[PDB]
Amino acid sequence: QRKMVREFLAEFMSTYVMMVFGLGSVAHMVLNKKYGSYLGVNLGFGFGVTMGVHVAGRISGAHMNAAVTFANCALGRVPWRKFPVYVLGQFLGSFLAAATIYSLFYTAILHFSGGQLMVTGPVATAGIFATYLPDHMTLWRGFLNEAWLTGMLQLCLFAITDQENNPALPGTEALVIGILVVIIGVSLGMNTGYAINPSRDLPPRIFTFIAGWGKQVFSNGENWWWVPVVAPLLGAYLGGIIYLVFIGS
Amino acid sequence: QRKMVREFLAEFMSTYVMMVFGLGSVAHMVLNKKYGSYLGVNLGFGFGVTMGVHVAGRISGAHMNAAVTFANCALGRVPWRKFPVYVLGQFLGSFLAAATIYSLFYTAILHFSGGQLMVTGPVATAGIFATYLPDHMTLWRGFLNEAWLTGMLQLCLFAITDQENNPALPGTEALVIGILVVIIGVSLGMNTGYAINPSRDLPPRIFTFIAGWGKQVFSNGENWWWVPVVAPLLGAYLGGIIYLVFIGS
Amino acid sequence: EILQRKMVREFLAEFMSTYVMMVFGLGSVAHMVLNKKYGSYLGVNLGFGFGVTMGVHVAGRISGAHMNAAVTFANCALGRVPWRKFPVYVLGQFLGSFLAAATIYSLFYTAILHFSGGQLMVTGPVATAGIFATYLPDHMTLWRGFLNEAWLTGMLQLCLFAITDQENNPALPGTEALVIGILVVIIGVSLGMNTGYAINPSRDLPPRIFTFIAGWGKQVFSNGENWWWVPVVAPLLGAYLGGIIYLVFIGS
Amino acid sequence: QRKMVREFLAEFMSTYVMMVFGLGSVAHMVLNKKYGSYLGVNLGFGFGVTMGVHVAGRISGAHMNAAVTFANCALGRVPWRKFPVYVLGQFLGSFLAAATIYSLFYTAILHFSGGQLMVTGPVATAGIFATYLPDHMTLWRGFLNEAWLTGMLQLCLFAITDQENNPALPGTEALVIGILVVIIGVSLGMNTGYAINPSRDLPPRIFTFIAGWGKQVFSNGENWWWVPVVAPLLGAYLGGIIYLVFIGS
């Protein structure tokens, strides 16, 4: 054994239940669209990220990300090298979860996706795990659409915890934290997905690149895999700072 | 009227009042589709779970069916001689709540079907009450989808009820568990619906068979009246051991 | 130059606790059966539920917040309240909802007229009246029209009493409200299809008496061979039947 | 940097979080309609209060919607000389909010606008920043309606923040105050697009008239910009008092 691995069971049974609701509900929309809604996803992710703090041990490991894994080193909260263990350790909850929703849904896309795992197009099923920015954007703006989609994932997250500026109640912190996430999938989720953490961009993207979809998950758009893995990083520490501007300093 | 009948009558009404918030939920989602929409039953049976959760002996037996009452008899809880009394007491209701979602939709299908109580095609009134698998799938994996739909609500039913590992609060349960059944239906409802408990599946499939439709309500998945009666009991043991091998042993 | 403390300071706060429910609920029915693009069915499923959770933060949190001329008749025969001061909960916040209808109407004076010609249409594909009162969408006679409103009433209380029986796992002292309209939210995804949920004799005698006054005519009280008396006698014999199915489980 | 002036920051943010959850959530039903929805406006708005709420000085420095601030001023629950501060410093939480949701969608807009800024017609844009009255609207309703939209905002606000008469618990505020405005959303925006607090109109309107839309943003409604700057001020002065008679006192 213990002393850092009772927690990596929670860090995993938290991210292995995030991507089942947040990233495993988009196949509820992009496969029937009259059984599933673009709401079923943006609402899936938040009110499923409730189960994801109901588990992780109250402050001692609940991140599920590498955008907020990284940031919680800006200041002396959780010094630097508790962090790299959670990045790779909590890709697994998103990789071998990305299967625990890929393997249970074969019969569904095999009558929707023909017999061919096409990456892009009119029966494309490669969106379900990765993040692809549609016709009307660039990376001039796709960097600033994850370093601001995660910059306020921090301002809005430091204001639901710090027991100084009057946040949530004791157990009434998951409902709001998931409700925090409903209203970004439904506000700025019309843009570079809302792959807002470097653990929905890559960890199920290196799960798509493995099952047989092709190299079009690492290249569709000049080179994408990197910005939802590099923008949340110097987006998070830059968003909770501009927050911490007003109370600290 | 003694101690242990004040245990069905308590678990009888949460298998007659979750079900009337979940059966008409579909018998309204798809029976009309204009007044009744695509969530329809995500938040109908979902939050119709919240109701019930506030209607049982506080947190000392509030299971609502014959499916989670079985994980909590082998994993140490509620000795087995208190397992089937609750199951049936519950089950004893699932029939008593459909047979009254009939007279509530009496002339809501006779102006819809004709006078024949059809189950498939242009007239579709037996996919509401029970479930019935779709045309894209066999039982090869609609069982694996029902020992995973009834084998992963236990990681949430533990992170919210168990009090050591930081949960929702005493009023805060129904709304973080009924808000699960909506978050369960926003991902994994596109497979078998969710027929997650054998107290929701059999007594309303025993009703579609006694109302006048006949034995075809069973002969639907060519045999589906045990796949969500043996996959759901075999997820509650397979999951309840995931959180307790995660934390415990 | 006189006293105004009494129960008339319940009356007054049943007034809003109703009035604020309606301008939320009624206000939303317009918002689908008048725009259909900026509005939906679901909007009333929950905009009526959280119209009632803002009814609650307007009346004593449990003692004064019925806002429903019937829950005021259910908690009288069981006994949680005396009788002779049952009027001034109906005749308060039921002429508290009548006068919320004329405040959703003259709030929509333009917004409707372009939707229904220049006609005060009761029945058709230009129907309006359904904003204020309810009508049975021809799916039924009264045989099911009284049996969807005294079981829809006795599916209410058993979910009311359970969150306010501070004995048997209710909400907190401060989350009663978020639930009890999210009762009404769900009433509109399981049961909200045939007669709607006109459970509330303050949403169905008061507003119907409004429309008939601003000119919808003597057709508001006929649609159903006469549909008015039902949700005014359908809830009272289904609240009394509604909350004795609970106290025959834990009471006496 | 630590006095009354560490409070524009409390409501720069609390207002900066009010626009950008909305202006981007109203530019989200309006720009794809298949990866978005209207509810997204009213609950991406209401729960974007929620986050507005948990940002500012606990309950008496967290308004953000400066027509409240007018009436929470004039009824004596604020020093009359600390009115302009909470506005203009939250009024800038609305400028530098529009400029910063016009940006995130810069690439998404011009693609379906070809290179030009239209205020009316079939390429309506600035309906998301400012507001404009429909086919079915005059200024008869143009004003009598924003006195009950800045009206009902109050009785339902005050009934929650005056902790005499059944309010929410001190964590339940922002969930059930944000959950208000989602109820004003699906009740009362199909007459005006509820501007309720002139915070929400005049600054991004002043933004969109600088943003090159030219003077049509002050035209439609013959002159529509003035009302949700004025009906709110002497429309929440009435949502206040009508409370303090019937309730309170």
Q: Is C191 on the interface with B (CB under 8 A)?
A: yes
| Beta carbons of A168 and D170 less than 8 Å apart | no
Find chain C residues with C-beta within 8 A of D246's C-beta.
12-13, 15-16
Alpha-carbon torsion C169, C175, C176, C179, what sign?
negative
What distance in Å separates residue A223's CA from the closest CA in chain B? 30
Cα D227 to chain center, whole Å?
13
User: Do the Cβ atoms of C31 and D186 come closer than 8 Å?
Assistant: yes
Question: In the complex, which subunits touch A with 3 or more CB pairs below 8 angstroms?
Answer: B, D
Long-range pairs for B122-127 at CB < 8 Å and ≥24 separation?
B124/B30, B125/B27, B125/B31, B126/B208, B126/B213, B126/B216, B126/B217, B126/B220, B127/B26, B127/B30
* φ, ψ of residue B193 in degrees (nearest 5): 55, -140
* Burial status of residue B232 (CB atoms within 10 A of its CB: 0-12, 13-18, 19 or more): buried
Tell me D167's DSSP state.
P
Length of chain C: 252
Q: Is D161 helix (H, G, I), strand (E, B) or coil?
A: helix
Chains that touch B (3 or more CB pairs under 8 A): A, C
A-B Cβ pairs (cutoff 8 Å, strict):
128
- Chain centroid, CA A179 distance in Å: 15
Query: Cβ–Cβ of B107/C186 closer than 8 Å?
Result: no
Question: CB under 8 Å to A147, separation ≥6 — which residues?
Answer: A231, A232, A234, A235, A238, A239
Angle in degrees, CA D78, D79, D80, rounded to 5 = 105
The two three-digit tokens of residue A57, written as one number: 């041990």
Where would I find the H helices in chain D? 8-29, 39-53, 67-74, 83-87, 92-98, 106-113, 140-144, 146-149, 152-161, 172-188, 202-210, 233-246
Give CA–CA dist D87/C189, Å, rounded: 41
Question: For B80-218, where are the alpha helices, taking DSSP H only?
Answer: 83-102, 139-142, 153-161, 174-185, 198-208
Q: Which of A16, A50, A51, A186 is the best residue to mutate to test the B interface, defined by the most B CB atoms within 10 Å of its own CB?
A: A51
Dihedral of the CA atoms A57, A58, A62, A67 (nearest 10)? -160
Check if D138 contacts C (Cβ < 8 Å): yes
Using an 8 Å Cβ cutoff, are D205 and D42 in contact?
no
Q: Which residues of chain A are within 8 Å of residue D6 when distances are taken between CB atoms?
A: 246
* Chain B contact for A171 (CB, 8 A cutoff): yes
Distance CA A48, CA C57 (A): 29
Q: What are the tokens at B91?
A: 């089950």
Q: How many CB pairs under 8 A join C and D?
A: 128
Touching check for B74 and chain A: CB below 8 Å?
A: no
Which residue on chain A is closest to D46 by alpha carbon? A183
CB distance from C237 to chain B under 8 Å?
no
Do C31 and C16 contact (CB within 8 A), yes or no? no
Q: Which residues pair with A191 in a beta bridge?
A: A193
Tell me, yes or no, if A176 comes closer than 8 A to chain B by beta carbon.
no
Q: Is B221 helix (H, G, I), strand (E, B) or coil?
A: coil
Indicate which CATH number applies to the domain containing C151: 1.20.1080.10
CB D167 within 8 A of CB D174: no
Of C221, A168, C34, whose CA–CA distance to D189 is shortest?
Answer: C34
Distance from the Cα of residue D119 to its chain's centroid: 20
CB burial of residue B152 (10 Å; 0-12, 13-18, 19+): buried
Give the Cα separation of A202 and A226 in Å (integer): 8
Count the Cβ atoms, other than its own, within 10 Å of residue C195: 27
d(CA C91, CA B41): 37
- Helix, strand or coil, per DSSP, at residue A63: coil
Residue (of B244, B26, B8, B4) closest to B130 by Cα position: B26
Please enumerate in sequence order all residues whose Cβ is within 8 A of that of C104, keeping only pairs 6 or more positions apart, or say none: C22, C23, C26, C27, C30, C131, C132
Strand partners, B190: B193
C-alpha to C-alpha distance for D24 and D7, rounded to whole angstroms: 25
CA count, 13 A, side-chain hemisphere, A208: 28
Distance of CA B49 to the CA centre of its chain: 9
Tokens representing residue A236 in the block:
């998070």
d(CA D60, CA A186): 29
**Start-to-end CA span in chain B (Å):** 40
Give CA–CA dist A82/A60, Å, rounded.
Answer: 11
Contact A58 B242 (CB under 8 A): no
Residue B249 CA to residue A2 CA, distance in Å, equals: 13
Rounded-to-integer distance, Cα C59 and Cα B165, Å: 37
3-state secondary structure of C157: helix
Rounded CA-CA distance B49/B58 in Å is 15
- Report the structure determination method: X-ray
User: Resolution in angstroms, to 1 decimal, for this deposition?
Assistant: 3.7
Amino acid B108 reads: A
Q: How far apart are CA C178 and CA C238, in angstroms?
A: 25
B135 touches chain A (CB under 8 A): yes
Q: Rounded distance, CA A100 to CA A90, Å?
A: 15
Compute CA distances A119 → A129, A130, A218, B2, B9, whole Å: 11, 10, 11, 63, 54
Contact between D47 and A183 using a beta-carbon 8 Å cutoff: yes
Amino acid A245 reads V
Eight-state DSSP code of residue B81? G
Instruction: Using DSSP, state whether B193 is helix, strand or coil.
Output: strand
For B79, the 3-state DSSP assignment is coil
Give the bridge partners for A193, in sequence order: A191
| CB pair distance less than 8 Å for C24 and D145 | no
Exposed/middle/buried for residue B87 (C-beta within 10 Å: 0-12, 13-18, 19+)? buried
CB D46 within 8 A of CB D185: yes
**D190 to chain C, minimum CA–CA distance in Å?**
7
Hey, is the C-beta of C113 within 8 angstroms of any chain D C-beta? yes
Give the number of beta-carbon pairs within 8 Å between A and D: 117
The whole-angstrom separation of Cα A244 and Cα B198 is 51
Residue C71 contacts residue C201 (beta carbons within 8 Å): no
**Which tokens is C129 given?**
């009246």
The C-alpha torsion from C153 through C158 and C162 to C168, rounded to 10°, is: 160
Q: Decide: A213 and A241 in contact? Cβ < 8 Å.
A: no
Q: Distance between CA B154 and CA B127 in Å, rounded?
A: 26
Whether B206 contacts B92, CB under 8 Å = no
Please list the residues that pair with D124 across neighbouring strands.
D118
Conformation bin of residue A37: beta by default, left when phi > 0, alpha when psi is -120 to 50: beta
Angle (deg, nearest 10), helices C49-56 and C182-190:
160
Task: Name the β-bridge partners of D118.
Answer: D124
Cα–Cα distance list, D101 to D93, D129, D182 (Å): 12, 9, 21
Between CA A183 and CA D51 the distance in angstroms is 10
d(C-alpha D51, C-alpha D43), whole Å: 12
Q: Give me C152's structure tokens.
A: 């829809």
Residues 6+ apart with CB under 8 A from D95: D203, D204, D206, D207
Interacting residues of C14 by C-beta distance below 8 A, sequence separation 6+? C59, C64, C65, C66, C67, C89, C92, C93, C96
Helix/strand number for chain A, H first, E second: 10, 0
Burial profile C59-74: b = 16 or more Cβ within 10 angstroms, e = fewer: bbbbebbbbbbbbbbb
Instruction: Give the C-alpha separation, A163 to C7, whole Å.
Output: 41
Token pair belonging to A227: 């910005």
Cross-chain Cβ contact D51/A180 below 8 Å: yes
**HSE-up (13 A, CA, CB side) for residue A62:** 19
Token pair for D153: 């905002």
Contact yes or no for A32/B191 (Cβ under 8 A) = no
Question: Can you give the residue range of the structural domain that contains A77?
Answer: 1-249
DSSP summary character for residue D138? -
What residue type is C120 in one-letter code? L
Tell me the one-letter amino acid at D130: A
Burial of B84 (0-12, 13-18, 19+ CB in 10 A): middle
Report the distance separating Cα B90 and Cα B83, nearest Å: 11
CB of B22 within 8 Å of any CB in chain C?
yes
Decide if A166 touches D, using CB distance below 8 A. Answer: yes
Which amino acid is residue B211, in one-letter code? A
Alpha helices by DSSP H, listed for chain B, are: 8-13, 23-29, 42-53, 71-74, 83-102, 139-142, 153-161, 174-185, 198-208, 227-230, 233-246
Interface test with C, best of B54, B58, B128, B161 (most C CBs within 10 A): B54
The values of phi and psi at residue D16, to 5°, are: -60, -30
By the 8 A CB rule, do A58 and B166 touch? yes
Helix (H/G/I), strand (E/B), else coil: B43: helix
Cβ D246–C109 below 8 Å, yes or no?
no
Q: Which of B38, B144, B168 sits opposite A35 (nearest CB)?
A: B38
Answer whether D15 touches A (CB < 8 Å): no
CA pair distance B222, B201, nearest whole angstrom: 16
**Does the beta carbon of C39 lie under 8 angstroms from any beta carbon of chain B?**
no
Alpha carbons C80 and C83: distance in angstroms, whole number? 10
Q: Select the residue of C162, C175, C189 nearest B43 (Cβ to Cβ).
A: C189
Q: Which amino acid is at D73?
A: C
B246: nearest CB among A13, A39, A43? A13
From D140's Cα to the closest Cα of chain A, the distance in A is 32
Answer whether A54's CB lies under 8 Å from B156's CB. yes
Residue C53 half-sphere exposure, CB side, CA atoms within 13 Å? 31
CB-based burial, D112-130: b 16+ in 10 Å, e otherwise: eeeeebebeeeeebbbbbb
Number of compact structural domains in chain D = 1
In 3D space, the residue among D37, D133, C152, A202 whose CA is nearest the CA of residue B20 turns out to be: C152
Among residues C142, C148, C133, C232, the alpha carbon closest in space to that of C194 is found at: C148
Q: How far apart are the C-alpha atoms of D232 and D67, rounded to whole Å? A: 6
A186:D20 CB<8 A: no
Residues B230, B145: Cα–Cα separation, whole Å: 12
Q: Cα(D136)–Cα(C114) distance, rounded to whole angstroms?
A: 7
